Design a protein around this ligand. Sequence first.
Ligand SMILES: CC(=O)Nc1nc(C)c(-c2cnc(F)c(NS(=O)(=O)c3sc(C)nc3C)c2)s1
Length: 578
Amino acid sequence: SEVAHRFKDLGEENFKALVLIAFAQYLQQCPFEDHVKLVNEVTEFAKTCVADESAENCDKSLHTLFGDKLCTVATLRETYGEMADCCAKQEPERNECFLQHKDDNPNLPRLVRPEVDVMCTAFHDNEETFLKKYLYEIARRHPYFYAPELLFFAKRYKAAFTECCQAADKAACLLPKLDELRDEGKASSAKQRLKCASLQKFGERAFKAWAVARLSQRFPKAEFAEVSKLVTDLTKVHTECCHGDLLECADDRADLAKYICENQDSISSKLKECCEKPLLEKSHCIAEVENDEMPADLPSLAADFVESKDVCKNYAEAKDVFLGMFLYEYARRHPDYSVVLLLRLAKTYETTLEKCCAAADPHECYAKVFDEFKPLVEEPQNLIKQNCELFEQLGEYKFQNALLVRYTKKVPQVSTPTLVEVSRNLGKVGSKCCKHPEAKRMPCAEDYLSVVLNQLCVLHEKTPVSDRVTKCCTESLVNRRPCFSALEVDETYVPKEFNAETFTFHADICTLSEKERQIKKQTALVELVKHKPKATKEQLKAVMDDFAAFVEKCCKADDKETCFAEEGKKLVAASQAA
Ligand SMILES: CC(=O)Nc1nc(C)c(-c2cnc(F)c(NS(=O)(=O)c3sc(C)nc3C)c2)s1
């Protein structure tokens, strides 16, 4: 019995919560009530298997069980659409099918926190139903959310309301704390979507090379064997989470934290505070703790990998082992390099070792390897440096605007809302990284730009409209950022004609908050670029501020919502003819 095994290992609480997530990630449109009932029935069924493990259905797989249950609500499909297709199959084809229909951009109401008092009301009226609400609503919008990690956000959510609902100022305690988990959640989500896109699109080998490079950077005093044991455990975990095997994912993550903490002196000296923490806090802490000190007496890389005469020899004996070794060795020496740069280095290392060990003289040609590594290292360096000056010059909002212009011209066929969600997230790179010294930027900046770009890939993949996004997204996971960066103004694209709809907005704008008031201005800024990409110097910004003045001036003109309609049809024609 699988469900009884997981039940025992995870505890009732976590079993419930993890099962709710799985369902919300597979049936995103389905009502909250339906999912909660279904979960209760599964839990009810689980308890019986824990009692007598030979009870009728207790030897079926978790997907068999969980899919049969989901399917009691899915297999009708007027509003559900195409998810009764998956219910006409048997496992393991059904799970493939559910997975395949995960929606990165579900048409769901874009989510708005009600007042603090009403929330404390519900939190105290029934605290269970309130917290299940948070899981359901985050999970169904983030169907790849790292499920063990979603339980931690859930615990911190609960503690916020526990502390703040007993405050003299419920709002001041709770606004900052809920603002934190919101931002932290989105970031958490975007990262996890990259881990799954790698496993799902590029295959486990590609993911193995990622964690080898990351854990080596983080645990550089650890031996290779050790680093490898960890990469193997960590790969499995994420494979299971990304393939909807969430109970086993959570169980294995806990095992891995437990092992890590029981082999600390073999891994790192920065693990003290993490391993003294309640179990969800623990895995979170481990997953993202500061890199350890780099050992003193490391010999030059070049000796084992370039100067040595046994390279082609040793390479051949075990290529994947030798290449991981290289990656291990190059990474632990460079916590100042982005992960994707380390992976670019190891690919170049690989293809050089491939042609040189065939040709006339191995020793001679592969000795040059390090000059092939040169340009690859400096291209990110100059970019992160160049884009951080710009940020300090312009500040965040204008830094976002600049990249919007940049990216719109890059890939003008892309949906305007997407460009807007992507360019803003790209622009967040400045406040996040530039802060740091130059020896900590590149990983901060480039691996984050990898994540945001991945977001552009998945949103576009839904309905492809741009050949260049497809190419840049399908080619090499690791070379995506150089790819997009390399793109210039698209000349094939023929501009969009304006019309009496794309801009003529209403009076609700004034009551909107700073942020939404920015996004609308940014949405219009994209359309101005789509409609005339070329001549777009300061003539863009001279019109964008004429929208800004227009909005502000017309907002505060005591008008019965009429100045907008009147003075709005004007400036579209005016900003066109300009
Ligand atoms: C129609 C409707 O009522 N939808 C909503 N359902 C839930 C559970 C909402 C919600 C409840 N409590 C919060 F506290 C936040 N906080 S938040 O919006 O800022 C957060 S927190 C987080 C991890 N993501 C977001 C978007 C959001 S709003």
